[PDB]
Structure formats: structure tokens, C-alpha cells
Amino acid sequence: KRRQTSMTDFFHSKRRLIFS
Amino acid sequence: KRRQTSMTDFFHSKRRLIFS
Amino acid sequence: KRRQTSMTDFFHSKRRLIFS
Amino acid sequence: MFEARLVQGSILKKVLEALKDLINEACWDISSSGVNLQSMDSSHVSLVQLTLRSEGFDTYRCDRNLAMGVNLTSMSKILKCAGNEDIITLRAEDNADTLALVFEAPNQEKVSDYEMKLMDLDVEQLGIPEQEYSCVVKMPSGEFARICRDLSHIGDAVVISCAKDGVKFSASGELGNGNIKLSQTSNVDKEEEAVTIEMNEPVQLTFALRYLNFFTKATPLSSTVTLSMSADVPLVVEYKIADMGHLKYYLAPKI
Amino acid sequence: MFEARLVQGSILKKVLEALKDLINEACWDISSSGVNLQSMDSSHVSLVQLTLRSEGFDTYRCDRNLAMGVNLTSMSKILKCAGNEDIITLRAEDNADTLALVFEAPNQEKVSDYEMKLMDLDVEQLGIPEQEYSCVVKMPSGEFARICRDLSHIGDAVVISCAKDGVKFSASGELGNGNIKLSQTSNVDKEEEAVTIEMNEPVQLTFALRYLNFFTKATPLSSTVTLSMSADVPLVVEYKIADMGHLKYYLAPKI
Amino acid sequence: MFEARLVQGSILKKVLEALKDLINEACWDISSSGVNLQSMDSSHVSLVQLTLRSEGFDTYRCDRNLAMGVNLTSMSKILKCAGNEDIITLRAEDNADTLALVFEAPNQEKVSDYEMKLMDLDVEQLGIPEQEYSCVVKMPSGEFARICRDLSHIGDAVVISCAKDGVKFSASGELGNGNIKLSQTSNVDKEEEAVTIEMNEPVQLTFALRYLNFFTKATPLSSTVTLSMSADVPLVVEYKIADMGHLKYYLAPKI
The missing domain is CATH 3.70.10.10 (Proliferating Cell Nuclear Antigen)
Structure with missing residues (x-):
């Protein structure tokens, strides 16, 4: 091993604003 | 609610000295 | 009771060097 | 001796x-x-x-x-x-x-x-008046303990509202609220698993849940528990000790 | 409504x-x-x-x-x-x-x-591509949870190596190492207790065990669990919810 | 090899x-x-x-x-x-x-x-003399563990006093004292559930309960446990490992 990647290194990040 | 009462607000308190 | 003894007060102690 | x-x-x-x-x-x-x-x-x-x-x-x-x-x-x-x-x-x-x-x-x-x-004690004893209560609810002990335990997850206080056909326990906190409504049971097939209510007047009282959670540790003493409530007075939580006697927990309300 | x-x-x-x-x-x-x-x-x-x-x-x-x-x-x-x-x-x-x-x-x-x-949220959502995986292992959920739990005693990381005839989980730490080899089962007497492997290419990936231990809390949802792995991409840990749907845990690898 | x-x-x-x-x-x-x-x-x-x-x-x-x-x-x-x-x-x-x-x-x-x-070790080994003991008590392991556990609630020390017809475990603390007397059993209906005593001379010894509580974690190894005691010498707590061997715990007394 070398580096712990994250899910954003593979999948495109969509920001969302949820009001409730 | 408004105020947490105690048992001494309702019942008369009798002090007791117990030796043993 | 008076004093908590140890196992070395009764049995002879043999030191050992274990390599692994 | x-x-x-x-x-x-x-x-x-x-x-x-x-x-x-x-x-x-x-x-x-x-x-x-x-x-x-x-x-x-x-x-x-x-x-x-x-x-x-x-x-x-x-x-x-x-x-x-x-x-x-x-x-x-x-x-x-x-x-x-x-x-x-x-x-x-x-x-x-x-x-x-x-x-x-x-x-x-x-x-x-x-x-x-x-x-x-044995030790020396300087304690206070209270004079408890022999009285009749407006609402008396006989219910399963495990049910009451479970209700207190559950509503302990919602808020610090519990509102017990007893009518003639049902008893309700409510709780409110910064996550929202919760209402638990137990109806009277037709005890045509039972005796101890039933929920019965003897009411003179409908009663609504608020109590601290931590004390009730202290009270429900007497659950192994009996399969049933009785709640005696009147307006603006301490609640009585009674557990019957079979062939022996009883254990009563009085709890001051939040007027 | x-x-x-x-x-x-x-x-x-x-x-x-x-x-x-x-x-x-x-x-x-x-x-x-x-x-x-x-x-x-x-x-x-x-x-x-x-x-x-x-x-x-x-x-x-x-x-x-x-x-x-x-x-x-x-x-x-x-x-x-x-x-x-x-x-x-x-x-x-x-x-x-x-x-x-x-x-x-x-x-x-x-x-x-x-x-x-309900609350306000400023969250991030990911676009997950519909893809085929190189290795897909269907195994008992309790077995997977047990394996993660056990290898959690050895090291921080787990090496999942899937071939055609078996799936292996390894771990290394300052106390030594540990290898767990699960072979494919002849499902001639079962269906859910079996370990099956669908492989296009042999896959070897390293993951953090704490996250997997977080994942295995979905064990009561199903008796089976599926692991989807491809080279240098997040692992998919899927639990089927019977007559309902599913719950998927994606975990980024340690390249 | x-x-x-x-x-x-x-x-x-x-x-x-x-x-x-x-x-x-x-x-x-x-x-x-x-x-x-x-x-x-x-x-x-x-x-x-x-x-x-x-x-x-x-x-x-x-x-x-x-x-x-x-x-x-x-x-x-x-x-x-x-x-x-x-x-x-x-x-x-x-x-x-x-x-x-x-x-x-x-x-x-x-x-x-x-x-x-494996690691390097600088340890001390003791020469243990092959001897005969004054009192040997064979009793249920769970019973011994239970006794140590219970007397651990009273005081820090336990006084084991073995006679010919019974074995007693006592404890004293600032809450008071406690005596547990186990009599010899007529093993006419059993073998492992029995309490037997082989005595040459009556023995009275005081021990630390924490160490005994460490010892009683070998309870799953056997249904029986043997206590060997002589005057002013370490107690032997032996658990037999069926078809295998044994595990012995020596404990220095409080003279």
C-alpha cells in the first residue's frame, strides 16, 4: 500500500442543498 | 411545566435520629 | 495477617535468557 | 431478638x-x-x-x-x-x-x-396522607419500564395524560416529540397482561424521566404496576410483592 | 402527501x-x-x-x-x-x-x-457509473463480519485477493501476520451458506478494516453479502434487503 | 521441526x-x-x-x-x-x-x-519442590469462582480454613464480615459435583482475592478444582485439562 484514497478520486462530486 | 417540586412541598417532614 | 509474601520467599529463583 | x-x-x-x-x-x-x-x-x-x-x-x-x-x-x-x-x-x-x-x-x-x-442516620421522614386518587392505572410493569426507557430517548420530561378510555405518555425534545397511547384492554382472555383505568377525573401531569427510570428497577418484583395520579400532587408508582407486601415510589411533579 | x-x-x-x-x-x-x-x-x-x-x-x-x-x-x-x-x-x-x-x-x-x-443539509453526492466488476464474491454475511472482526486483531489493513477457486483475506501488524482462505463451495446441498466466485480477472486490493467493521453492521439485513472488486477502484459491499431493495457500501482502496 | x-x-x-x-x-x-x-x-x-x-x-x-x-x-x-x-x-x-x-x-x-x-525474554523461573500437602480440597470450579467473586464484595483478603469435615472461606472489610462454609458431600449420587477433603492437619491461610479472581479464569478448563494448602506456604490451585494435562496457580500467603 501507499496512500488511502477517497471516493471523490473516482466519482464526480455533486453538491446539493437540502432544506427542511 | 414551570418548576420541579419536591416531596417536602406536599408532605410534612419529620426528622429522625437513628443510632446503630 | 501481617505481610504479603512473594513466590521467591519460598522457591529458588533461576534466571533464564530466551532468544527468539 | x-x-x-x-x-x-x-x-x-x-x-x-x-x-x-x-x-x-x-x-x-x-x-x-x-x-x-x-x-x-x-x-x-x-x-x-x-x-x-x-x-x-x-x-x-x-x-x-x-x-x-x-x-x-x-x-x-x-x-x-x-x-x-x-x-x-x-x-x-x-x-x-x-x-x-x-x-x-x-x-x-x-x-x-x-x-x-449498621450505621448512624440523620434522616427525614414524611407524613403521607391516606387518600383517594383521581386516576389509577394498572398496567404491565415491563410495558411501563419500556415506555419510560423509550421516551428517555426523546426528552427529559414525560407528560402522562389519563382519560377514561386510554392513558398517554408524551415527550418533547430538540429532535422532536413522541406520543404513546395505551388503550384499555378487554380482559376477557387475561388478567395480568391487561391495561385497566379507574378514573374520577382526567389527569395530566409532567414528570422527570430519570427518576422513573430509577423506579422501573423494581420490575422483577411484579408483573404488574399501578400508577396513582391526582392534580398537582406526587405520582404513586406501586409494585406489589406477591404474598408479602409492596414497594411504592412517590415522584414530585413539574407544576 | x-x-x-x-x-x-x-x-x-x-x-x-x-x-x-x-x-x-x-x-x-x-x-x-x-x-x-x-x-x-x-x-x-x-x-x-x-x-x-x-x-x-x-x-x-x-x-x-x-x-x-x-x-x-x-x-x-x-x-x-x-x-x-x-x-x-x-x-x-x-x-x-x-x-x-x-x-x-x-x-x-x-x-x-x-x-x-428535519434539518438543512449541505451534502456532496457522487455520480456512480454503472459498471461490470472483475471479481464478484457471494458469501455468508456472518462469515465476512467474523473475518473482518478477526483480522482487526492483527493489523489495520486487510488484503483481499480473489482468484477463481478461492478468496483470501490477509492482515499484517507488529505481532505478525494472518491469512484466511475461503474456497468455493459445492452448493449441491445449500444456497445461502455457500461461497461462490465470479471472476473475469484475479483481483488484489488493500482496505482499511475500521470502515469494513462499520459496514458489517448491516449483517442483520441479509444472510448473504456480495463483494465487487476491480483493480484500483472502490470495493462494493452489498447487502440484499429481501422483497425490498439493497444497501451498498463503497470503500476506497489503498493504492 | x-x-x-x-x-x-x-x-x-x-x-x-x-x-x-x-x-x-x-x-x-x-x-x-x-x-x-x-x-x-x-x-x-x-x-x-x-x-x-x-x-x-x-x-x-x-x-x-x-x-x-x-x-x-x-x-x-x-x-x-x-x-x-x-x-x-x-x-x-x-x-x-x-x-x-x-x-x-x-x-x-x-x-x-x-x-x-516470537520475542526475547529475560525471565525468572522457580524451583518447585515435589511435596505432600496438609490439606487437599476437591470442589466444583464454578463454586470456587463464585465464592471468590462473592467474598470480593466484602474485603480484599480471604481466610481459607480447612478442617476434616468442612472448608470455610471468610472475608472482612469496613462493611462487616462474611463466612462461607462448605461441608463434605456424600458422593453416593455423584462424582464431579462433590466436595471432598483430604486432611493431614487443619490449615488456616490468608490470601489476596484479586489474584484468586485472576486464577478463576481457568474455570472453563475443568468442572473441578483442587486446593492444596500447608502452613505458611503458597496455595496451589489446580485445574485438570481432560486427556491433556493441567494448569496450576501458586499464590503466596499473607503471613
């Missing part, structure tokens, strides 16, 4: 497992009619009244009345040393500052002797 | 017992096809995708789509107030900032109403 | 669950006659002697004697990765600083390999 032989000793164990967390110390009044206890907790918000009648014991002897200052912590510690099927004997003198507890195992070949140091 | 009646309510409880520890807050997307959830944990190392299809519920009604900002902590707290045999109804409006949860006991005589405060 | 195949592997697990809390590190002496261990705890108040004879294993091979410096913490951690019905194989070389542990599941289709790092 005071000597009480109790075959079903586990009861007493339960009695100490329902008290030692709410009250650390208490005066045990021993008389010919049996054992009586009355003690407020350190905050004086709740009170407990224990009654163990003499006919509940297998044998009983009490010449003159005795007031035993007892540390319920140490007593629970001692009762932890007794098995469930153990026959337990309580024995005390008059010129002695201790209480003897003899535990007999069903072998018979194991015998335990415990001497508990 | 949104209303979902679910007879086997325990499922939902399990759903919240498999999420609230990994993600504290999440957006619940409600549509005519059912319930969808997607949320990374605070470290963005793992992601979760929940799917509860509408046919899984006893009844279902959803006029217009709704995005509910939900605190999974408080929601788990509320679902703790529901029994296992309880029938659970979810109900929400459009101009309301809360979610109603109705718990019905199998008496029928006990009824619970809970109103959960 | 050293190789020991043991079908009833759980035994070894138990062996490590009865040691790792009292001693963190120990030297395992492997010979043709089997496995021997001797180790004082860090306070040198107690000692442990483990014996696992070679005939107890399913198969056994040992060409030349080996002294394995073992960290019992890590070893217990590794044995935690083995099931109860697992067949366990121990394997070690001569020019290798590790110990191999192979765990085989009853499928057969699951296989585990663990390599434990």
Missing part, C-alpha cells in the same frame, strides 16, 4: 436491587407486623415506601420494635452473595450494632453467614 | 442501525419508485447507497418527489422506540419540516406517534 | 484466556513429552505452571527441545481468530523466530494461517 426466615430469598435481593441506586442509606423499621421503610432520595424529589408484612416470611419473631440504620449499598453487596434459590434468614439483637444474614443453599451442605455493620 | 405502510418494520430499524454510526446525517430522496439514499462519511473514504423500492412496502403513496434532510442519529433514536413486530408507517407533507412515524403494536391496542425534526 | 495437531482446539484458546490477564509474556518449553510453562506475574506474588502432555494432542512431533519466548497478549489475540470447533495445528522450526498456527474449520473449506512473532 428479631428473626425472619424467608424461603423465597430472591425477593429481598430484588428489594435491594430496586433501592440501592435511588437511595444509598435508609432506616429499616422492624415491628411485629413486619418491615417498613420510608426514604427520600438525596434531592428529595422522590420518596420510597417499602412494606414487607410478617406473614410473607416463612417464620417471624419480633419482641420489641427496632430502627436499623442501614447502608443499602453494603446491604446490596451482601445480598449479591446469595443465590436465587437461597433461603435467607435475617437476625438481629438489641444491644448489637449489626445485622446478621444467613444464606442457605438447596444442597443442603452450603451455608453462608454475613455480619453487616 | 407521502405515506409508506411497512408491516415488517424491523427492517427499517436495521436500516438505521447500519447507517447511524457511519453517517450522522443524510438526505432521503422519496419518489414514486421508492426511497433512495446516497452519502459519504465525514472522511469521504466510504460511501453508502440505500434503496428501498415501493413494492417492498405494504402500501405506498408519493405524489411529488421529496428531499428530506435527516439526522440519522435522532432517527435511530426514534426507531429504538419501535418493537420488532411493530408495523411502521412513514408520513410526510410538503409544507412541513418534519417526518411522522407511526408505530403499531400487534395487540392491537398500543399506538405510538413520533414527529422527527 | 515441531508440529502438534490438536482436534479439540478450544482447549488451547481457554489456556490463553486463563493466562494472558495474569501474565503478559512467558517462555513456552517444547519437548518430546509435551509443552511446559512456568511464569510469575509482574509482582511475583503468584506463579503459573502449565502442562500439556504430548498424548493429549491428536498428533505430535518434536525432534529437539525449543524455548519459545511468547507474548501471551498477541497469542490470545491470534487464538481469538479461531473457532471453538476448529482443529488447531502448532508448527515451528529451529532457525525461525516465529510460531505458525493453522486453524481448520469443520466445513472443510475454510483455512486460516497465522504467523506469530
Whole structure:
């Protein structure tokens, strides 16, 4: 091993604003 | 609610000295 | 009771060097 | 000389497992009619009244009345040393500052002797008036304990609202609210699993859930529990001790 | 108006017992096809995708789509107030900032109403590509959980190496190493207790065991678990929710 | 080459669950006659002697004697990765600083390999004289564990007083005292549930209860336990390992 990647290194990040 | 009462607000308190 | 003894007060102690 | 032989000793164990967390110390009044206890907790918000009648014991002897200052912590510690099927004997003198507890195992070949140091106590006792209550709800003990436990997840306070056809327990906190409605049961197929309500007037009271959670540790004493409520007065939570007596938890409301 | 009646309510409880520890807050997307959830944990190392299809519920009604900002902590707290045999109804409006949860006991005589405060959320959602994986291993869930639990005693990382005839989980730490080799089973006497492997190419990946230990809390949802692995991409740990949908845990590797 | 195949592997697990809390590190002496261990705890108040004879294993091979410096913490951690019905194989070389542990599941289709790092040790071993004891009490292990557990609630010390017709365990603290008297049993209807006493002279000794509570973690190894006591010498608490050997706990008294 070398580096712990994250899910954003593979999948495109969509920001969302949820009001409730 | 408004105020947490105690048992001494309702019942008369009798002090007791117990030796043993 | 008076004093908590140890196992070395009764049995002879043999030191050992274990390599692994 | 005071000597009480109790075959079903586990009861007493339960009695100490329902008290030692709410009250650390208490005066045990021993008389010919049996054992009586009355003690407020350190905050004086709740009170407990224990009654163990003499006919509940297998044998009983009490010449003159005795007031035993007892540390319920140490007593629970001692009762932890007794098995469930153990026959337990309580024995005390008059010129002695201790209480003897003899535990007999069903072998018979194991015998335990415990001497508990009694202590001095400066306690407060309350005069409790013999009264009629507006609402009396008889329900499963495990149900009540479960309800208090669950509503303890919502808020600090519980609103008990009793009508004629149902009893409701509500709770509110910064996560929202919760309502639990128990209806009266048609006890045509049961007796102890039923929820019954005797009402003179509908009652609505608010209580602290931590104290109730202290109260519900008397659940192993009975399969049923009774709630007595009147307007702006302490709630009575009663557990019946079969063939013995009772244990009552009084809780001051939040007016 | 949104209303979902679910007879086997325990499922939902399990759903919240498999999420609230990994993600504290999440957006619940409600549509005519059912319930969808997607949320990374605070470290963005793992992601979760929940799917509860509408046919899984006893009844279902959803006029217009709704995005509910939900605190999974408080929601788990509320679902703790529901029994296992309880029938659970979810109900929400459009101009309301809360979610109603109705718990019905199998008496029928006990009824619970809970109103959960919904919150505002600024979350990140990921675009997950529909793909084929090199290695797909179907195995007992308890077996996987047990393996992760055990290898958690050896090191921080686990090396999953899948061939055609077997799947291996290894771990190394300052106390030494450990190898666990599960062979393919001849499912001539079973179906769910079997270990099967569908391989296009042999795969070797390293993962953090703490996240997997977070994942294995979805074990009560299914008797089986599927592991989808390809080279240098996040692992997919899928639990099937019977007659309902699924719960997927994506975990980024240690390249 | 050293190789020991043991079908009833759980035994070894138990062996490590009865040691790792009292001693963190120990030297395992492997010979043709089997496995021997001797180790004082860090306070040198107690000692442990483990014996696992070679005939107890399913198969056994040992060409030349080996002294394995073992960290019992890590070893217990590794044995935690083995099931109860697992067949366990121990394997070690001569020019290798590790110990191999192979765990085989009853499928057969699951296989585990663990390599434990061995360490350097500067330990003290004691010469234990082969002697006859004044009092030898054979009693149920759970009974002894229960007694130690119970008297642990009273005081720090336990007074074991053995006569010819009974064995007594007493304890005193600032809450009072407690006496537990076990009489000899008429073993006309049993064998293992009995309490027997072989006495040359009546013995009275005082011991620390924490160490005994450490000792009673070997309870799953046997249904019986034997106590060997003589005047002003360490007590021997022996647990028999069926078809295998034994585990002995020596405890220095409070003269």
C-alpha cells in the first residue's frame, strides 16, 4: 500500500442543498 | 411545566435520629 | 495477617535468557 | 431478638436491587407486623415506601420494635452473595450494632453467614396522607419500564395524560416529540397482561424521566404496576410483592 | 402527501442501525419508485447507497418527489422506540419540516406517534457509473463480519485477493501476520451458506478494516453479502434487503 | 521441526484466556513429552505452571527441545481468530523466530494461517519442590469462582480454613464480615459435583482475592478444582485439562 484514497478520486462530486 | 417540586412541598417532614 | 509474601520467599529463583 | 426466615430469598435481593441506586442509606423499621421503610432520595424529589408484612416470611419473631440504620449499598453487596434459590434468614439483637444474614443453599451442605455493620442516620421522614386518587392505572410493569426507557430517548420530561378510555405518555425534545397511547384492554382472555383505568377525573401531569427510570428497577418484583395520579400532587408508582407486601415510589411533579 | 405502510418494520430499524454510526446525517430522496439514499462519511473514504423500492412496502403513496434532510442519529433514536413486530408507517407533507412515524403494536391496542425534526443539509453526492466488476464474491454475511472482526486483531489493513477457486483475506501488524482462505463451495446441498466466485480477472486490493467493521453492521439485513472488486477502484459491499431493495457500501482502496 | 495437531482446539484458546490477564509474556518449553510453562506475574506474588502432555494432542512431533519466548497478549489475540470447533495445528522450526498456527474449520473449506512473532525474554523461573500437602480440597470450579467473586464484595483478603469435615472461606472489610462454609458431600449420587477433603492437619491461610479472581479464569478448563494448602506456604490451585494435562496457580500467603 501507499496512500488511502477517497471516493471523490473516482466519482464526480455533486453538491446539493437540502432544506427542511 | 414551570418548576420541579419536591416531596417536602406536599408532605410534612419529620426528622429522625437513628443510632446503630 | 501481617505481610504479603512473594513466590521467591519460598522457591529458588533461576534466571533464564530466551532468544527468539 | 428479631428473626425472619424467608424461603423465597430472591425477593429481598430484588428489594435491594430496586433501592440501592435511588437511595444509598435508609432506616429499616422492624415491628411485629413486619418491615417498613420510608426514604427520600438525596434531592428529595422522590420518596420510597417499602412494606414487607410478617406473614410473607416463612417464620417471624419480633419482641420489641427496632430502627436499623442501614447502608443499602453494603446491604446490596451482601445480598449479591446469595443465590436465587437461597433461603435467607435475617437476625438481629438489641444491644448489637449489626445485622446478621444467613444464606442457605438447596444442597443442603452450603451455608453462608454475613455480619453487616449498621450505621448512624440523620434522616427525614414524611407524613403521607391516606387518600383517594383521581386516576389509577394498572398496567404491565415491563410495558411501563419500556415506555419510560423509550421516551428517555426523546426528552427529559414525560407528560402522562389519563382519560377514561386510554392513558398517554408524551415527550418533547430538540429532535422532536413522541406520543404513546395505551388503550384499555378487554380482559376477557387475561388478567395480568391487561391495561385497566379507574378514573374520577382526567389527569395530566409532567414528570422527570430519570427518576422513573430509577423506579422501573423494581420490575422483577411484579408483573404488574399501578400508577396513582391526582392534580398537582406526587405520582404513586406501586409494585406489589406477591404474598408479602409492596414497594411504592412517590415522584414530585413539574407544576 | 407521502405515506409508506411497512408491516415488517424491523427492517427499517436495521436500516438505521447500519447507517447511524457511519453517517450522522443524510438526505432521503422519496419518489414514486421508492426511497433512495446516497452519502459519504465525514472522511469521504466510504460511501453508502440505500434503496428501498415501493413494492417492498405494504402500501405506498408519493405524489411529488421529496428531499428530506435527516439526522440519522435522532432517527435511530426514534426507531429504538419501535418493537420488532411493530408495523411502521412513514408520513410526510410538503409544507412541513418534519417526518411522522407511526408505530403499531400487534395487540392491537398500543399506538405510538413520533414527529422527527428535519434539518438543512449541505451534502456532496457522487455520480456512480454503472459498471461490470472483475471479481464478484457471494458469501455468508456472518462469515465476512467474523473475518473482518478477526483480522482487526492483527493489523489495520486487510488484503483481499480473489482468484477463481478461492478468496483470501490477509492482515499484517507488529505481532505478525494472518491469512484466511475461503474456497468455493459445492452448493449441491445449500444456497445461502455457500461461497461462490465470479471472476473475469484475479483481483488484489488493500482496505482499511475500521470502515469494513462499520459496514458489517448491516449483517442483520441479509444472510448473504456480495463483494465487487476491480483493480484500483472502490470495493462494493452489498447487502440484499429481501422483497425490498439493497444497501451498498463503497470503500476506497489503498493504492 | 515441531508440529502438534490438536482436534479439540478450544482447549488451547481457554489456556490463553486463563493466562494472558495474569501474565503478559512467558517462555513456552517444547519437548518430546509435551509443552511446559512456568511464569510469575509482574509482582511475583503468584506463579503459573502449565502442562500439556504430548498424548493429549491428536498428533505430535518434536525432534529437539525449543524455548519459545511468547507474548501471551498477541497469542490470545491470534487464538481469538479461531473457532471453538476448529482443529488447531502448532508448527515451528529451529532457525525461525516465529510460531505458525493453522486453524481448520469443520466445513472443510475454510483455512486460516497465522504467523506469530516470537520475542526475547529475560525471565525468572522457580524451583518447585515435589511435596505432600496438609490439606487437599476437591470442589466444583464454578463454586470456587463464585465464592471468590462473592467474598470480593466484602474485603480484599480471604481466610481459607480447612478442617476434616468442612472448608470455610471468610472475608472482612469496613462493611462487616462474611463466612462461607462448605461441608463434605456424600458422593453416593455423584462424582464431579462433590466436595471432598483430604486432611493431614487443619490449615488456616490468608490470601489476596484479586489474584484468586485472576486464577478463576481457568474455570472453563475443568468442572473441578483442587486446593492444596500447608502452613505458611503458597496455595496451589489446580485445574485438570481432560486427556491433556493441567494448569496450576501458586499464590503466596499473607503471613
